[PDB]
Write a protein that binds this ligand. Structure first.
Ligand SMILES: [Zn+2]
Length: 116
């Protein structure tokens, strides 16, 4: 019947309760979350480039380094435009399909969101 939750960092009265996914203090009329008040970057497994930017499933990318292709005759050059990518589960994973050779996987650390 009693809350095992922390007090209120504003009242310390301890008359705090849990209303769903956080703690609400009915005293000072302010809800707060113990750890989430600090907040962190979650949903961050989205594929990020060496530019420090985040891509979108369908966005246009461009390798910013000289990358070879092992099974294909193609060599990936700084400016290799591959659009409409697929964001895979791992942040180190850009799935892309390339007219001609086929589908390929790209190292996030070697690619970049074009900006278009
Ligand atoms: Zn309070």
């Amino acid at each position: 019947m009693v809350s095992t939750l922390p007090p209120c960092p504003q009242c310390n009265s301890e008359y705090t309760y849990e209303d769903g996914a956080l703690l609400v203090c009915p005293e000072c009329a302010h809800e707060w979350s113990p750890n989430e008040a600090a907040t962190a970057s979650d949903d961050g497994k989205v594929i990020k480039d060496s530019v420090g930017n985040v891509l979108q499933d369908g966005d246009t990318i461009t390798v910013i380094k000289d990358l070879k292709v092992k099974g294909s005759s193609l060599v990936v050059k700084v400016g290799t435009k591959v659009k409409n990518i697929r964001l895979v589960d791992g942040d180190h994973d850009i799935d892309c399909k390339i007219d001609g050779i086929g589908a390929m996987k790209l190292k996030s650390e070697f690619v970049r969101k074009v900006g278009s």
